[PDB]
Design an enzyme around this catalytic site. Sequence first.
Site, PDB file in Angstrom:
ATOM      1  N   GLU A  27       0.884  -1.145   0.000  1.00  0.00           N
ATOM      2  CA  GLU A  27       0.000   0.000   0.000  1.00  0.00           C
ATOM      3  C   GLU A  27       0.932   1.208   0.000  1.00  0.00           C
ATOM      4  O   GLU A  27       0.863   2.067   0.874  1.00  0.00           O
ATOM      5  CB  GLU A  27      -0.889  -0.041   1.245  1.00  0.00           C
ATOM      6  N   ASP A  28       1.884   1.234  -0.925  1.00  0.00           N
ATOM      7  CA  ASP A  28       2.755   2.395  -1.048  1.00  0.00           C
ATOM      8  C   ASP A  28       2.550   2.760  -2.477  1.00  0.00           C
ATOM      9  O   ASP A  28       2.496   1.866  -3.324  1.00  0.00           O
ATOM     10  CB  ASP A  28       4.216   2.059  -0.754  1.00  0.00           C
ATOM     11  N   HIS A  29       2.394   4.055  -2.747  1.00  0.00           N
ATOM     12  CA  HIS A  29       2.171   4.469  -4.122  1.00  0.00           C
ATOM     13  C   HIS A  29       3.209   3.857  -5.072  1.00  0.00           C
ATOM     14  O   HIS A  29       2.862   3.019  -5.910  1.00  0.00           O
ATOM     15  CB  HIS A  29       2.094   5.988  -4.307  1.00  0.00           C
TER      16      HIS A  29
END
Length: 138
Positions: A123-125
């Site tokens: 869930e990290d760009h």
Amino acid sequence: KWTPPRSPFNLVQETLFHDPWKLLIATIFLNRTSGKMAIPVLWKFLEKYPSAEVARTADWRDVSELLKPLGLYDLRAKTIVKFSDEYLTKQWKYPIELHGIGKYGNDSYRIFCVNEWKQVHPEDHKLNKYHDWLWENH
């Protein structure tokens, strides 16, 4: 001999995967910080501290001085030292067991350092970009 495919996104992780300590440090640097700002200070830090062995030895006041003005540079400095010592001295299987490493840290490890990227749900760009891309070109 797990080699994360090169991606059109040039995440620094793709560059450091061959040495988990560095890749992990890198995640402490990038953690909730612009790559704009974090990447130039990362390279200056690896240049000056090219291995955990050297890192765990240093004094955080000097590490901080060098990380200035990255932001929570004090806190990041102390972390880097303590994580480096734990990295060598503790008998661990995943880097999430280590000081300073969280989900971002551990996800990055399992996509790039070991072959477990199907079980990872980042869930990290920037990280998802890598992961989605790699689902498709697989």
